[PDB]
């Protein structure tokens, strides 16, 4: 999840994207790192199957 | 049902862990763009590559100043490419004139 969202952010910044999409992607990156260090801490815990 | 047992995808060999002689080997020095140095031990009879992906992760070239001219590829496809392959220059220039006289007739009246 972190690698996908980071690569998507990198291609969005390289391609030139409006501010809404880039800030949404950075919020998704933040939530991915937050789930990596502590899932279930802030908000809904990231579920599996 | 069965069993449980599992294996890492890889073999575990066991030989003599000798240290007295080995295959002799060189040390090459690669360099990134931002002044980072990295040393890579290659074997002696080994064609040393000019560029090498370093421990930092960016592409690093060798400290020997040969520069073998890698002939970096074209930009893949641009918005200018996707526009030009479906229109023409006189049409785009016509629209350029239309916006030019549009901002003209906006500005000075």
């Amino acid at each position: 999840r972190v690698i996908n969202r980071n690569n998507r952010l990198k291609r969005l910044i390289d391609l030139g994207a409006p501010e809404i999409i880039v800030n949404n992607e950075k919020r998704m990156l933040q939530e991915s790192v937050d789930a990596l260090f502590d899932n279930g801490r802030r908000g809904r815990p990231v579920t599996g199957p | 049902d069965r069993v449980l047992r599992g294996s890492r995808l890889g073999a575990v060999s066991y030989e003599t862990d000798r240290n007295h002689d080995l295959a002799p080997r060189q040390i090459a020095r690669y360099r990134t763009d931002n002044g980072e140095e990295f040393e890579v031990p290659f074997a002696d009879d080994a064609e040393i590559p000019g560029t090498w992906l370093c421990r930092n992760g960016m592409e690093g070239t060798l400290i020997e100043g040969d520069l073998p001219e890698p002939k970096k590829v074209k930009p893949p496809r641009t918005h200018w490419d996707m526009l030009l392959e479906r229109r023409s220059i006189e049409e785009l220039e016509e629209l350029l004139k239309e916006r030019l006289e549009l901002i003209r007739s906006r500005r000075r009246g």
């Binding site: 291609r11 999409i21 949404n24 992607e25 998704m28 | 918005h79 629209l95 239309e98 916006r99």
Partner: protein, 146 residues
């Protein structure tokens, strides 16, 4: 009750909430800019293609080229920036189309915001390769790329 100020003040105070669901935060973000119509799309696409031709011609005349006139250079850079404004405006316009197409592919495989962002990237590709002279509504052509 439209007026007085209390019934709308409650709406403004409800607009500034936390809403820790990032999905709902993104929807409250994208509900801001207004949806468009066909003549507006034609106008936007003409502005975008004009700005792209302007920056191509400016790069061509920049190399080996011209001491440009001040008015002509100033407003061709105006066109160059206005094209990008129109591009970002159309992207913002059809974000909601992206959400409405990606809403039915949830429930399996991936999350929801990842699907939204991939639809947005497809929407960028569609607004790059959109033609208007075929005379169609934009959603018909963009749905394929999304």
């Amino acid at each position: 009750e439209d007026e007085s100020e209390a019934l709308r003040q409650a709406r403004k105070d409800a607009e500034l909430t936390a809403s820790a669901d990032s999905v709902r935060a993104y929807l409250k973000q994208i509900g801001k800019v207004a949806l468009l119509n066909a003549e507006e799309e034609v106008e936007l696409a003409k502005r975008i293609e004009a700005g792209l031709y302007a920056t191509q011609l400016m790069t061509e005349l920049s190399e080996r080229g011209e001491k440009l006139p001040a008015a002509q250079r100033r407003d061709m850079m105006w066109i160059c920036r206005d094209g990008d404004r129109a591009k970002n405006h159309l992207l913002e316009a059809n974000l909601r189309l992206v959400v409405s197409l990606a809403k039915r592919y949830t429930g399996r495989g991936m999350a929801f915001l990842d699907l939204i962002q991939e639809g947005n990237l497809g929407l960028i590709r569609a607004v790059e390769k959109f033609d208007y002279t075929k005379g169609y509504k934009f959603s018909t052509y963009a749905t394929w790329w999304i």
